[PDB]
């Protein structure tokens, strides 16, 4: 629903939705070649399935397809400075592919924005929705349209007959965090099959030992997972498939 | 790749006139082709240009007289109440690859039409 | 949607380097491409994207230029350079009209 829907927002109002209390798995997000684009600056995407975060925050939007370079930690651009900024130590990456078959048309898809101008550069992670006019000159514009008075915001112009630069690109971006919180979502790891009455190294959720693995009917265990023996010995494990 | 066409004669003003840019070599519905003109001993003018997909684009100058079409292997465009200043030399460019529009990197051997009585 | 090719025209000796500079009227980021048009010929591509070689073009040509500004300057230029030079590059397409092409300069080479 984030990477691939039939609605995506504009970059001055990128859509933001958290992912939390999630089995994520990038292999699948790796192997896809679908993508135009796919690095990541602080981690190596080959093994985030390992890596374990606390919150994954998501942001979606479409921008021109030779502006996606501005998206990018210490980028100085345009839309960099006025629509979306990253901060210098962002933790997270890019996802970006072509987009022409939905996001184009013949007569010109205008229902994109992008801002132009604004007083200031804005901070990382920040979002503007005022659509104020833009003042250059001496008298007040008081939000009446006309000279010297510029809107903020234009439309683009995307069509088939645009170069691939111009052409319309639908950009994904997913960050991470870590904070003084317990962590929920990262990769689901893997599970071998089991083999019995054999002299094995078993690893039960962080239970590492070695012994053979016989069939035991000990007793019911209606809630619990270990078993102990007098001593600080687990005799007995329950198993979790 | 070789791109070539032709096409070129003499014709009053006012009168139709059909040239063909013919492909070989390549497939046409991967490469977008686009035509160029230059008056004798003036500078390059942009005329129009056709997508692989189809769509088609033209020139403000141009006004709206030409007429770009696709087939098989005929890229063909087709004016209309032709005027005394249409004398020049007439292109049609290839491209490089897959997108990447306007780079022209194949050109033909290069025809030319003229109007007069 | 306008481009600009100044100088004209410029001379220079064998042993001696010219600049060519082309400006937009627009933005263009670093869609802008030269060519060269021999007298009777079609022009070569020689430079895509203000900054890379085409395929088989001699390693004394070389461009610059980003945004608005663009420049196109030859090394150690021989009699075989002797021709014209033009530049081209996208205008968006609801902006401008598609693609226009520039003024062009003559180069001759005593």
């Known amino acids: 629903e984030v990477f691939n829907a039939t609605r995506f927002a504009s970059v001055y109002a990128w859509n933001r939705k958290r992912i939390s209390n999630c089995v994520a798995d990038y292999s699948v997000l790796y192997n896809s070649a679908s993508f135009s684009t796919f690095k990541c600056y602080g981690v190596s995407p080959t093994k985030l399935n390992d890596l374990c975060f606390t919150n994954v925050y998501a942001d979606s939007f479409v921008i021109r397809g030779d502006e996606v370079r501005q998206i990018a930690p210490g980028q100085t651009g345009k839309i960099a400075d006025y629509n979306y900024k990253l901060p210098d130590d962002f933790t997270g990456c890019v996802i970006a592919w072509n987009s022409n078959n939905l996001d184009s048309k013949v007569g010109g898809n205008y229902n994109y924005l992008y801002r132009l101008f604004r007083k200031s550069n804005l901070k990382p992670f920040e979002r503007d929705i005022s659509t104020e006019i833009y003042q250059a000159g001496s008298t007040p514009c008081n939000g009446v349209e006309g000279f010297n008075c510029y809107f903020p915001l234009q439309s683009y112009g995307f069509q088939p007959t645009n170069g691939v630069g111009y052409q319309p690109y639908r950009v994904v971006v997913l960050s991470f965090e870590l904070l003084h919180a317990p962590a929920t979502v990262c990769g689901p790891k893997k599970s071998t099959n089991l083999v019995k009455n054999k002299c094995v190294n078993f690893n039960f959720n962080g239970l590492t030992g070695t012994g053979v693995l016989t069939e035991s009917n000990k007793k019911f265990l209606p809630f619990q997972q270990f078993g102990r023996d007098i001593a600080d010995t687990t005799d007995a494990v329950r198993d979790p498939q | 790749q070789s791109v070539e066409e032709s096409g070129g004669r003499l014709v009053t003003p006012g009168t139709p006139l059909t040239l063909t840019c013919t492909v070989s070599?390549?497939?046409?519905?991967?490469?977008?082709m686009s035509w160029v003109r230059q008056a004798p001993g003036k500078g390059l003018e942009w005329i129009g240009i056709?997508?692989?997909?189809?769509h088609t684009a033209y020139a403000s100058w141009a006004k709206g007289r030409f007429t770009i079409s696709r087939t098989s292997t005929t890229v063909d465009l087709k004016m209309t109440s032709l005027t005394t200043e249409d004398t020049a030399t007439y292109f049609c460019?290839?491209?490089?690859?897959?997108?990447?529009?306007?780079?022209?990197?194949?050109w033909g051997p290069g025809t030319v039409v003229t109007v007069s009585s | 949607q306008v481009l600009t090719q100044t100088p004209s025209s410029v001379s220079a000796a064998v042993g001696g380097t010219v600049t060519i500079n082309c400006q937009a009227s627009?933005?263009?980021?670093?869609?802008l491409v030269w060519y060269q048009q021999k007298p009777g010929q079609p022009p070569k591509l020689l430079i895509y994207?203000?900054?890379t070689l085409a395929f088989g073009v001699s390693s004394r040509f070389r461009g610059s230029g980003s945004g608005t500004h663009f420049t196109l300057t030859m090394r150690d230029v021989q009699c075989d350079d002797a021709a014209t030079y033009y530049c081209?590059?996208?205008?968006?397409?609801?902006?401008?009209?598609?693609?226009?092409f520039g003024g062009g300069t003559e180069v001759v080479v005593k």
């Open positions: 460019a290839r491209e490089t690859g897959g997108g990447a529009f306007y780079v022209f990197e194949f």
């Open positions: 070599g390549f497939s046409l519905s991967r490469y977008a």
């Open positions: 056709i997508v692989d997909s189809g």
């Open positions: 627009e933005d263009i980021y670093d869609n």
């Open positions: 994207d203000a900054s």
């Open positions: 081209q590059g996208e205008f968006s397409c609801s902006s401008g009209d598609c693609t226009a």
